[PDB]
From Swiss-Prot:
N6-acetyllysine PTM sites in chain numbering: K55
Section covered of the full-length record: 55 to 155 of 217
Protein name, as recorded: Growth factor receptor-bound protein 2
Family as reported in the entry's similarity comment: Belongs to the GRB2/sem-5/DRK family.
Functional summary from the UniProt entry: Non-enzymatic adapter protein that plays a pivotal role in precisely regulated signaling cascades from cell surface receptors to cellular responses, including signaling transduction and gene expression. Thus, participates in many biological processes including regulation of innate and adaptive immunity, autophagy, DNA repair or necroptosis. Controls signaling complexes at the T-cell antigen receptor to facilitate the activation, differentiation, and function of T-cells.
Cross-link Glycyl lysine isopeptide (Lys-Gly) (interchain with G-Cter in ubiquitin): where in chain: K55
Swiss-Prot/TrEMBL domain comment: The SH3 domains mediate interaction with RALGPS1 and SHB.
């Protein structure tokens, strides 16, 4: 039960920035469908005064990744990154956006 609070579909990059900058917690994120690369996904994460963007890559076997570790789904990529940093230079952990029912 309950849909994932992180899939925003074709929400533009600048609109993801605007929405996430208003979030209080560092790590508040969303997965969006890219406009610069049709058919691809992008990860937008809040961290301080910035909203960082990551490109969700896909190999020949259809597995998703950001760096080296491969995942069979976007769901597994997201979940893994809730406890392992999405960034190499900084320690950024993904946590669901604060939504009101
Ligand atoms: C500071 C946040 C990241 C640590 C940084 N982001 C970056 O290097 C982002 C660059 C960027 O944002 N250039 C403008 C690239 C990007 C480019 C396009 C995107 O899709 P759309 O166009 O926003 O829908 C998403 C990310 C990075 O090292 N990313 C790695 C890992 C990754 N998979 O993005 C990379 N560039 O391979």
């Amino acid at each position: 039960m309950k849909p994932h609070p992180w899939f925003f579909g074709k929400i533009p990059r600048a609109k993801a920035e605007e929405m996430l900058s208003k979030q209080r917690h560092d790590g508040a994120f969303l997965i969006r469908e890219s406009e610069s690369a049709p058919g691809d996904f992008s990860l937008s994460v809040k961290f301080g005064n910035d909203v960082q963007h990551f490109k969700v890559l896909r190999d020949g076997a259809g597995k998703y990744f950001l760096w080296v570790v491969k995942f069979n789904s976007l769901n597994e990529l997201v979940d893994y990154h809730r406890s392992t940093s999405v960034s190499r230079n900084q320690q950024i952990f993904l946590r669901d956006i604060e939504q009101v029912p």
